[PDB]
Design an enzyme around this catalytic site. Structure first.
Site: not given
Ligand SMILES: CCNC(=O)[C@H](CCC1CCCCC1)NC(=O)c1ccc(CNC(=O)c2cnn(-c3ccccc3)c2N)cc1
Length: 341
Positions: A164, A29-33, A49, A26-27
């Site tokens: 994030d 690359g916007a979300y990473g892998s 992820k 999904v995404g």
């Molecule tokens: C720099 C790297 N950051 C981190 O270290 C943080 C750590 C936790 C943070 C949470 C918020 C407060 C600060 C700490 N890490 C994550 O947030 C973090 C880690 C893993 C994931 C995995 N999930 C997804 O990717 C996800 C879920 N929904 N969808 C989705 C889908 C369609 C449309 C829209 C969304 C995604 N793409 C998701 C977030």
């Protein structure tokens, strides 16, 4: 230990437990892998992820450790949480990949404001949930620092989670003035500035402060909030920053009701309290939740704080294999959340 199976997806190998099926990226690359997947244990869609090169350097290794520590901490309805964390590795010695599993969200707020023009009711409920998550985060001495619409996700029920995604929407557009130049005098309320910027944009359909760079960004901010007066100038230590601010021609504070014309006056009042230049005077998340703008939603018995978070690792300078082994420990000690819902 469960049974894994392997496959290739857009250049990358994925090795995951059989529990997770029908992986689809999904995404772009916007979300990473990250793949959407079906979790056969709950009958729910999830996101998985795969960390990119988690142990390539001391810096990646520390970032990997940090992400896993943060995720394992977060237990709140408005903050992303950890459903599972796994590695195909049977030992520390072959540990090289880290997979994180979370709820799959429906859409980000960037895509939502870009599509739709939100009602005052939707803005109330979305900003309420952001603030409620921030109260939680901030209570653990954690500052997000990169709050922007693409880091907020919502489901069709409008339930919101703070995330994030890390490295369209410039971070600098949502960043507090005190951490525009130097990182010397700042608190958790950098995040509240960001919430003000987000809320403005939800209300108007327009990036409030679309600066081209750090200097332009600061000029746009001062045009709304006014150049700092004598009091606030006394608290700027940086000669070059104070020189810069004092070299500008003075600008008065705007009347926010003349800027956010036709908005709910209670939205305007909260915005005034969030977009204050002096970070000692900016409203906190906890204070904001009690603002009359959220009267329909605010319940002081259901705005929980967090458990203590041990951030002492942040000050440490360790070797790659040390950060890797700490990360391994955290994978092994992970206790999944209760299933039922
Ligand atoms: C720099 C790297 N950051 C981190 O270290 C943080 C750590 C936790 C943070 C949470 C918020 C407060 C600060 C700490 N890490 C994550 O947030 C973090 C880690 C893993 C994931 C995995 N999930 C997804 O990717 C996800 C879920 N929904 N969808 C989705 C889908 C369609 C449309 C829209 C969304 C995604 N793409 C998701 C977030």
């Amino acid at each position: 230990r469960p049974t894994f199976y392997r496959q290739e997806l857009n250049k990358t190998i994925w090795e995951v437990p059989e529990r997770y099926q029908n992986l689809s990226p999904v995404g772009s690359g916007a979300y990473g892998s990250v793949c959407a997947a079906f979790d056969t244990k709950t009958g729910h869609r999830v996101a998985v992820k795969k960390l990119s090169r988690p142990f390539q350097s001391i810096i990646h290794a520390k970032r990997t450790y940090r992400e896993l520590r943060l995720l394992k901490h977060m237990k709140h309805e408005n903050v992303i949480g950890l459903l599972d964390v796994f590695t195909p590795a049977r030992s520390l010695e072959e540990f090289n990949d880290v997979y994180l599993v979370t709820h799959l969200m429906g859409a980000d707020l960037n895509n939502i404001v870009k599509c739709q023009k939100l009602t005052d009711d939707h803005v109330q409920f979305l900003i309420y949930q952001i603030l409620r998550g921030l109260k939680y985060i901030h209570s653990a001495d954690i500052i997000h620092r990169d709050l922007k619409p693409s880091n907020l996700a919502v489901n069709e029920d409008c339930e919101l989670k703070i995330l994030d995604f890390g490295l369209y929407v410039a971070t600098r557009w949502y960043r507090a003035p005190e951490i525009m130049l130097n990182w010397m005098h700042y608190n958790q309320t950098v995040d509240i500035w960001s919430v003000g910027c987000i809320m403005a944009e939800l209300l108007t359909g327009r990036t409030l402060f679309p600066g081209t760079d750090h200097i332009d960004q600061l000029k746009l901010i001062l045009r709304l909030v006014g150049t700092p007066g004598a009091e606030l100038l006394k608290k700027i230590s940086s000669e070059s920053a104070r020189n810069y601010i004092q070299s500008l021609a003075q600008m008065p504070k705007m009347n926010f009701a003349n800027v956010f014309i036709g908005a709910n006056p209670l939205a305007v009042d909260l915005l005034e309290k969030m977009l204050v230049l002096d970070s000692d005077k900016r409203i906190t998340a906890a204070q904001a939740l009690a603002h009359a703008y959220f009267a329909q939603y605010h319940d002081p018995d259901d705005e929980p704080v967090a458990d203590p978070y041990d951030q002492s690792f942040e000050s440490r300078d360790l070797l790659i294999d040390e950060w890797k082994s700490l990360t391994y420990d955290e994978v092994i000690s992970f206790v999944p959340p209760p299933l039922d819902q």
